[PDB]
Amino acid sequence: LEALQKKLEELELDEQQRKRLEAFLTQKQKVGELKDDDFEKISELGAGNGGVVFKVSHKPSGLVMARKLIHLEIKPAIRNQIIRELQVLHECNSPYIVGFYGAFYSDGEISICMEHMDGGSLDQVLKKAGRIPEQILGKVSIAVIKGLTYLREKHKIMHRDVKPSNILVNSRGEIKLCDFGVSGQLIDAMANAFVGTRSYMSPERLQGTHYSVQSDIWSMGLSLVEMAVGRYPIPPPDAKELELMFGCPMAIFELLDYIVNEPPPKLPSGVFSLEFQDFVNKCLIKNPAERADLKQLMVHAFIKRSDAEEVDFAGWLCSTIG
Amino acid sequence: SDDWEIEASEVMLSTRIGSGSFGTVYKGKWHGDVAVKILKVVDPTPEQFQAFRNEVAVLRKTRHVNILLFMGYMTKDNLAIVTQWCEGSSLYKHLHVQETKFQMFQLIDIARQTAQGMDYLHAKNIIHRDMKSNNIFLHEGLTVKIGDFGLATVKSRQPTGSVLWMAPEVIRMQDNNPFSFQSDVYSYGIVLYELMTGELPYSHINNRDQIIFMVGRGYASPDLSKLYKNCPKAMKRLVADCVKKVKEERPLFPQILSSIELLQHS
Ligand SMILES: CNS(=O)(=O)Nc1nccc(Cc2c(C)c3ccc(Oc4ncccn4)cc3oc2=O)c1F
Ligand SMILES: Nc1ncnc2c1ncn2[C@@H]1O[C@H](COP(=O)(O)OP(=O)(O)NP(=O)(O)O)[C@@H](O)[C@H]1O
Ligand SMILES: CCCS(=O)(=O)Nc1ccc(F)c(C(=O)c2c[nH]c3ncc(Cl)cc23)c1F
């Protein structure tokens, strides 16, 4: 209640961020234990390979929320432990992490109710924008680097799934992370219950060796390339396809095999800045030890440039989706 | 059409049982309890209409006590298939949710009946292509019924449910058609593993993409050290034989059946 507000003061916020975080925590106090009966469906906000996400209204509070339905057949003991482990999200209050309201189990689906983002995922944004301008990919990078270091310091947790569809954006110009690995039982359950069409997985995680947040940095670099150019990069673009996006399919195993055997993808030269190119090249180093880490990324030239560049992110977003 | 199309006014949909990505399964009423699988397709293309009537034609050829009883279809309002209702739960729920205490003689019977149903399908030139313990239902607890075969014509518009039961040749997808009687045997082998261990394979790996890579390369395989101690040593051999990485080294179901039948003669 006010134990949440004490941990706000342990973070380095500015004037406009503390305003919004304090406003969200007060709305967290309007809602109690959530149930399937408490919600009125508004619209549908996604159809991931995993579970459908609805925009919904919580009747007692009036609040609008995003409801992720995760269908899983698990014994009741695992159900209760998944909901217990998800409660750490009440304490995950940061400008770069989407908010949490509550989680519960109904029917055969775990419901996760979280902060609504009217901008959607950058996956959804990408398919409307074609490609994302580099200036904005600088601001996105900052948000991701800050969200990962927040998780590692204040929670000792990795994201484990950094992808364009797990980065969400707000009309207020906020860029936040979502769908990270809080519950170890939920991690085990979703490996057995779904299949994937693409992969942002680090080559060391594919091979079973020891991994750290460096794997998330590799995933960020792969997401940045995919958002810079307008295509997933594991199968590098053809000499033709390059000359069809700027001017002057593989099965899941073949993708995973490529990420382990062939050199990582690169940003196409000439169309992007040299620093941004060097930035993704430092993120996509295969050996995790010689890959850039989180502090090195925050002092890289591309980040100090982008942090200083005042960009109207909120404006560009409302122009390209409406 | 043909005489297996059911008018929608005749069917009363009751409760919601399961909901995957390719459709939703409701319990219903149509001359007694029935199961209705409604496909998530609101604008079915003339192509998908033909693939549906084709998969229905394949369902029309199965009449066997270990195969789920096809009963009819609906093609106007929506695309759906009507089958018998199994009173028990799926084999997955028995083994991994309820954790029901089967005895050793019951596990072999489930193994034998599953092989009996699969033998029938292959004798009719039907490849399941997506066998898991989710698709094996225990009607009233005693007799297994195999379902979720067919409609591989409409699902391709490689399975997208789970990878735990996929044969390595199917995981790699290097052929245009890696599906065979032995890819089904591998899947049956993984179900045998479930039956004889009580848990799913690769329980220590929690990364689907790791599982896909490790199993496609041959670096990972079901851990047979977790087989029950009361599991007969001939049954242990059968698990290993079905799970073999080489597609041509795996037994066919006439042999699998005989292996179990002679084992069953205690
Ligand atoms: C692909 N990587 S993996 O390691 O194999 N698997 C997994 N990776 C990450 C995660 C998971 C499991 C997982 C999911 C999917 C999740 C989704 C939404 C959520 O809600 C929420 N609310 C507010 C803010 C942030 N999240 C919390 C969540 O916690 C989890 O542990 C993996 F299963
Ligand atoms: N809190 C939220 N607010 C707004 N949109 C959300 C929220 N949570 C999820 N979404 C949307 O839900 C969509 C699908 O998400 P999800 O179901 O996680 O599948 P995915 O991320 O596209 N891939 P996978 O992780 O394999 O399921 C995303 O594109 C988001 O835009
Ligand atoms: C003859 C096979 C038809 S199918 O291959 O399309 N599979 C199918 C079709 C319709 C269904 F309802 C189902 C199904 O899931 C069930 C059928 N009977 C059941 N009884 C219990 C449960 Cl939990 C599930 C089912 C099902 F597996």
GROMACS .gro file of N, CA, C and O in nm, chain A residues 82-142:
model
  244
   82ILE      N    1   0.173  -2.096  -0.944
   82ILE     CA    2   0.191  -1.998  -1.050
   82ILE      C    3   0.134  -1.863  -1.008
   82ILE      O    4   0.198  -1.758  -1.027
   83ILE      N    5   0.015  -1.863  -0.949
   83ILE     CA    6  -0.044  -1.737  -0.902
   83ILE      C    7   0.037  -1.678  -0.788
   83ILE      O    8   0.048  -1.556  -0.776
   84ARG      N    9   0.095  -1.762  -0.701
   84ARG     CA   10   0.179  -1.708  -0.594
   84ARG      C   11   0.302  -1.639  -0.652
   84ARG      O   12   0.337  -1.528  -0.610
   85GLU      N   13   0.368  -1.703  -0.748
   85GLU     CA   14   0.489  -1.647  -0.806
   85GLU      C   15   0.460  -1.523  -0.890
   85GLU      O   16   0.548  -1.437  -0.906
   86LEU      N   17   0.339  -1.512  -0.945
   86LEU     CA   18   0.303  -1.394  -1.022
   86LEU      C   19   0.282  -1.271  -0.935
   86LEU      O   20   0.279  -1.159  -0.988
   87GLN      N   21   0.266  -1.288  -0.804
   87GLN     CA   22   0.242  -1.174  -0.716
   87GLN      C   23   0.364  -1.083  -0.702
   87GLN      O   24   0.349  -0.971  -0.651
   88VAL      N   25   0.482  -1.128  -0.744
   88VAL     CA   26   0.599  -1.040  -0.744
   88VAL      C   27   0.576  -0.923  -0.839
   88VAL      O   28   0.641  -0.818  -0.825
   89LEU      N   29   0.480  -0.936  -0.931
   89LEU     CA   30   0.449  -0.828  -1.024
   89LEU      C   31   0.377  -0.711  -0.958
   89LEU      O   32   0.373  -0.602  -1.017
   90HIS      N   33   0.321  -0.730  -0.839
   90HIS     CA   34   0.270  -0.616  -0.763
   90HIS      C   35   0.383  -0.522  -0.724
   90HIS      O   36   0.362  -0.400  -0.711
   91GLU      N   37   0.503  -0.576  -0.706
   91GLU     CA   38   0.621  -0.499  -0.667
   91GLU      C   39   0.705  -0.458  -0.786
   91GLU      O   40   0.815  -0.405  -0.767
   92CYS      N   41   0.657  -0.480  -0.908
   92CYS     CA   42   0.732  -0.444  -1.028
   92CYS      C   43   0.667  -0.317  -1.082
   92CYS      O   44   0.586  -0.319  -1.175
   93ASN      N   45   0.705  -0.205  -1.022
   93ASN     CA   46   0.652  -0.074  -1.057
   93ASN      C   47   0.770   0.009  -1.106
   93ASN      O   48   0.854   0.052  -1.027
   94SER      N   49   0.775   0.032  -1.237
   94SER     CA   50   0.883   0.104  -1.300
   94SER      C   51   0.829   0.171  -1.425
   94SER      O   52   0.732   0.121  -1.484
   95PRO      N   53   0.887   0.283  -1.468
   95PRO     CA   54   0.841   0.345  -1.593
   95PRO      C   55   0.860   0.258  -1.715
   95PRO      O   56   0.795   0.282  -1.818
   96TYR      N   57   0.946   0.156  -1.708
   96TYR     CA   58   0.983   0.075  -1.824
   96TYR      C   59   0.925  -0.066  -1.816
   96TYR      O   60   0.966  -0.153  -1.894
   97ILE      N   61   0.832  -0.091  -1.724
   97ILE     CA   62   0.769  -0.221  -1.703
   97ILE      C   63   0.618  -0.198  -1.696
   97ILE      O   64   0.572  -0.115  -1.617
   98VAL      N   65   0.542  -0.272  -1.777
   98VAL     CA   66   0.397  -0.253  -1.776
   98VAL      C   67   0.342  -0.294  -1.640
   98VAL      O   68   0.398  -0.380  -1.570
   99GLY      N   69   0.230  -0.232  -1.602
   99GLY     CA   70   0.178  -0.252  -1.469
   99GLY      C   71   0.100  -0.381  -1.454
   99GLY      O   72   0.062  -0.445  -1.552
  100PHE      N   73   0.078  -0.419  -1.329
  100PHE     CA   74   0.009  -0.542  -1.294
  100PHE      C   75  -0.109  -0.508  -1.203
  100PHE      O   76  -0.101  -0.417  -1.120
  101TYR      N   77  -0.219  -0.580  -1.220
  101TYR     CA   78  -0.338  -0.562  -1.138
  101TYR      C   79  -0.371  -0.685  -1.056
  101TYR      O   80  -0.407  -0.673  -0.938
  102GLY      N   81  -0.360  -0.804  -1.114
  102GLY     CA   82  -0.387  -0.927  -1.044
  102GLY      C   83  -0.392  -1.046  -1.138
  102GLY      O   84  -0.403  -1.029  -1.260
  103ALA      N   85  -0.384  -1.166  -1.082
  103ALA     CA   86  -0.387  -1.288  -1.160
  103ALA      C   87  -0.473  -1.390  -1.088
  103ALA      O   88  -0.478  -1.393  -0.965
  104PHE      N   89  -0.541  -1.474  -1.166
  104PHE     CA   90  -0.630  -1.575  -1.110
  104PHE      C   91  -0.645  -1.687  -1.212
  104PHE      O   92  -0.608  -1.673  -1.328
  105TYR      N   93  -0.700  -1.799  -1.166
  105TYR     CA   94  -0.723  -1.914  -1.251
  105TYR      C   95  -0.873  -1.941  -1.260
  105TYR      O   96  -0.942  -1.948  -1.158
  106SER      N   97  -0.922  -1.956  -1.383
  106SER     CA   98  -1.061  -1.988  -1.409
  106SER      C   99  -1.063  -2.089  -1.523
  106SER      O  100  -0.972  -2.090  -1.606
  107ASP      N  101  -1.168  -2.171  -1.528
  107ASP     CA  102  -1.181  -2.271  -1.633
  107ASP      C  103  -1.051  -2.349  -1.643
  107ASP      O  104  -1.009  -2.414  -1.547
  108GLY      N  105  -0.986  -2.344  -1.759
  108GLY     CA  106  -0.857  -2.408  -1.777
  108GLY      C  107  -0.752  -2.307  -1.820
  108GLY      O  108  -0.657  -2.342  -1.891
  109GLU      N  109  -0.767  -2.182  -1.777
  109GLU     CA  110  -0.681  -2.073  -1.822
  109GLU      C  111  -0.638  -1.984  -1.706
  109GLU      O  112  -0.720  -1.944  -1.624
  110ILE      N  113  -0.508  -1.953  -1.701
  110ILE     CA  114  -0.457  -1.852  -1.609
  110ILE      C  115  -0.480  -1.714  -1.670
  110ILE      O  116  -0.432  -1.685  -1.781
  111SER      N  117  -0.552  -1.628  -1.599
  111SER     CA  118  -0.576  -1.491  -1.641
  111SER      C  119  -0.476  -1.397  -1.576
  111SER      O  120  -0.462  -1.396  -1.453
  112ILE      N  121  -0.406  -1.318  -1.657
  112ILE     CA  122  -0.314  -1.216  -1.608
  112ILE      C  123  -0.368  -1.081  -1.653
  112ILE      O  124  -0.376  -1.053  -1.773
  113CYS      N  125  -0.404  -0.997  -1.556
  113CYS     CA  126  -0.461  -0.866  -1.582
  113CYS      C  127  -0.355  -0.760  -1.554
  113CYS      O  128  -0.297  -0.757  -1.445
  114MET      N  129  -0.330  -0.674  -1.652
  114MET     CA  130  -0.215  -0.586  -1.650
  114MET      C  131  -0.252  -0.452  -1.713
  114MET      O  132  -0.364  -0.434  -1.763
  115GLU      N  133  -0.158  -0.358  -1.710
  115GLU     CA  134  -0.184  -0.223  -1.758
  115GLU      C  135  -0.215  -0.223  -1.906
  115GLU      O  136  -0.145  -0.286  -1.986
  116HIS      N  137  -0.318  -0.149  -1.944
  116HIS     CA  138  -0.355  -0.137  -2.084
  116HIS      C  139  -0.262  -0.038  -2.153
  116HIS      O  140  -0.229   0.067  -2.098
  117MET      N  141  -0.221  -0.073  -2.275
  117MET     CA  142  -0.138   0.014  -2.356
  117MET      C  143  -0.209   0.032  -2.488
  117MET      O  144  -0.226  -0.064  -2.564
  118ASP      N  145  -0.253   0.155  -2.516
  118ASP     CA  146  -0.329   0.181  -2.638
  118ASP      C  147  -0.241   0.180  -2.762
  118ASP      O  148  -0.293   0.165  -2.873
  119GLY      N  149  -0.109   0.194  -2.746
  119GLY     CA  150  -0.020   0.185  -2.861
  119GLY      C  151   0.004   0.044  -2.911
  119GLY      O  152   0.038   0.027  -3.028
  120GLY      N  153  -0.013  -0.056  -2.825
  120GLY     CA  154   0.013  -0.193  -2.864
  120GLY      C  155   0.160  -0.229  -2.855
  120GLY      O  156   0.243  -0.155  -2.803
  121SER      N  157   0.191  -0.347  -2.907
  121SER     CA  158   0.328  -0.394  -2.917
  121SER      C  159   0.395  -0.336  -3.041
  121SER      O  160   0.330  -0.305  -3.140
  122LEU      N  161   0.528  -0.319  -3.032
  122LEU     CA  162   0.603  -0.276  -3.150
  122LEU      C  163   0.592  -0.375  -3.265
  122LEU      O  164   0.616  -0.337  -3.380
  123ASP      N  165   0.559  -0.501  -3.237
  123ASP     CA  166   0.522  -0.592  -3.344
  123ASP      C  167   0.403  -0.537  -3.422
  123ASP      O  168   0.407  -0.528  -3.546
  124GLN      N  169   0.296  -0.500  -3.351
  124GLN     CA  170   0.180  -0.442  -3.417
  124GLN      C  171   0.215  -0.308  -3.482
  124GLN      O  172   0.168  -0.278  -3.592
  125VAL      N  173   0.296  -0.227  -3.414
  125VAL     CA  174   0.339  -0.099  -3.469
  125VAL      C  175   0.419  -0.118  -3.597
  125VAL      O  176   0.400  -0.046  -3.696
  126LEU      N  177   0.509  -0.217  -3.598
  126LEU     CA  178   0.595  -0.240  -3.713
  126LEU      C  179   0.513  -0.268  -3.839
  126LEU      O  180   0.543  -0.215  -3.946
  127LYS      N  181   0.409  -0.351  -3.828
  127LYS     CA  182   0.332  -0.386  -3.946
  127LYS      C  183   0.250  -0.270  -4.001
  127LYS      O  184   0.201  -0.279  -4.114
  128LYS      N  185   0.234  -0.162  -3.925
  128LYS     CA  186   0.175  -0.039  -3.976
  128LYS      C  187   0.278   0.063  -4.023
  128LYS      O  188   0.252   0.136  -4.120
  129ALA      N  189   0.394   0.070  -3.957
  129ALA     CA  190   0.497   0.166  -3.992
  129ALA      C  191   0.590   0.120  -4.103
  129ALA      O  192   0.671   0.199  -4.151
  130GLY      N  193   0.580  -0.006  -4.147
  130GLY     CA  194   0.677  -0.057  -4.242
  130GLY      C  195   0.805  -0.093  -4.169
  130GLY      O  196   0.827  -0.209  -4.133
  131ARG      N  197   0.891   0.007  -4.150
  131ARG     CA  198   1.008  -0.002  -4.065
  131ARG      C  199   1.001   0.110  -3.962
  131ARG      O  200   0.928   0.208  -3.980
  132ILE      N  201   1.077   0.096  -3.854
  132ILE     CA  202   1.081   0.196  -3.748
  132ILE      C  203   1.200   0.289  -3.771
  132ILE      O  204   1.311   0.239  -3.794
  133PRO      N  205   1.181   0.420  -3.767
  133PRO     CA  206   1.294   0.513  -3.784
  133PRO      C  207   1.400   0.494  -3.676
  133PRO      O  208   1.371   0.457  -3.562
  134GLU      N  209   1.525   0.520  -3.715
  134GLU     CA  210   1.639   0.492  -3.627
  134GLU      C  211   1.635   0.578  -3.502
  134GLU      O  212   1.670   0.531  -3.393
  135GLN      N  213   1.595   0.704  -3.515
  135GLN     CA  214   1.583   0.793  -3.400
  135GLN      C  215   1.497   0.731  -3.291
  135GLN      O  216   1.529   0.739  -3.172
  136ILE      N  217   1.386   0.668  -3.331
  136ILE     CA  218   1.295   0.606  -3.236
  136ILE      C  219   1.353   0.477  -3.180
  136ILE      O  220   1.340   0.448  -3.061
  137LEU      N  221   1.418   0.396  -3.265
  137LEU     CA  222   1.485   0.276  -3.217
  137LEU      C  223   1.593   0.309  -3.114
  137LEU      O  224   1.628   0.222  -3.034
  138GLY      N  225   1.646   0.431  -3.115
  138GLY     CA  226   1.732   0.474  -3.007
  138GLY      C  227   1.657   0.487  -2.875
  138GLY      O  228   1.703   0.440  -2.771
  139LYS      N  229   1.540   0.551  -2.879
  139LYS     CA  230   1.459   0.567  -2.759
  139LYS      C  231   1.408   0.432  -2.708
  139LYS      O  232   1.401   0.409  -2.587
  140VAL      N  233   1.371   0.342  -2.800
  140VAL     CA  234   1.328   0.208  -2.760
  140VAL      C  235   1.442   0.135  -2.691
  140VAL      O  236   1.423   0.070  -2.588
  141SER      N  237   1.563   0.142  -2.749
  141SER     CA  238   1.678   0.076  -2.688
  141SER      C  239   1.694   0.120  -2.543
  141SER      O  240   1.700   0.036  -2.453
  142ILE      N  241   1.694   0.252  -2.519
  142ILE     CA  242   1.707   0.303  -2.383
  142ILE      C  243   1.605   0.238  -2.291
  142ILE      O  244   1.638   0.189  -2.183
   0.00000   0.00000   0.00000
